[PDB]
């Protein structure tokens, strides 16, 4: 938004196996004013 | 004491007393239900 890259993250402990039912807000971590154009991404997977 | 303050571009006039409201690590200043400035965090010592 307005040329800023905002990061919101949260590390919720897991009670169960996958996607437990519950609510948890995502507190912002770092705001970075880059101001570029973003349309695509690709996650990186570690290879050992 | 009744003084005028300017906190990171937030200005106003009033008295400043020690509070007990616990801000989140990122929240800067607090507002009321009627949406008026009520509590601010000191930018230097992170005091509320």
């Amino acid at each position: 938004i307005d040329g800023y890259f905002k990061i919101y993250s949260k590390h919720t402990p897991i009670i169960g196996r996958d996607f437990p039912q519950g609510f948890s807000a995502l507190e912002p971590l770092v705001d970075l004013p880059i101001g570029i154009n973003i349309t695509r991404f690709q996650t990186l997977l570690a290879l050992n | 004491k009744c003084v005028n303050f300017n906190f990171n571009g937030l200005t106003g006039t009033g008295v400043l007393t020690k509070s007990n409201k616990k801000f989140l690590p990122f929240q800067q200043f607090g507002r009321d239900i009627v949406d008026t400035t009520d509590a601010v965090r000191d930018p230097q010592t992170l005091e509320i």
Partner: protein
């Protein structure tokens, strides 16, 4: 006298539990408080 005592003894029940009545004073208080809050909230408006 017994009928009146029995009738007056049920006043403290039907006044609150049945709702119905006793809402006009609450409506007055709520309306005045809401008008005050709406008047105060208008200060944050831009009006262009």
């Amino acid at each position: 006298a017994n009928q009146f005592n029995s009738a007056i003894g049920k006043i403290q029940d039907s006044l609150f539990s049945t709702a119905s009545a006793l809402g006009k004073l609450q409506d007055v208080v709520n309306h005045n408080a809401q008008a005050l809050n709406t008047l105060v909230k208008q200060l944050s408006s831009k009006f262009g």
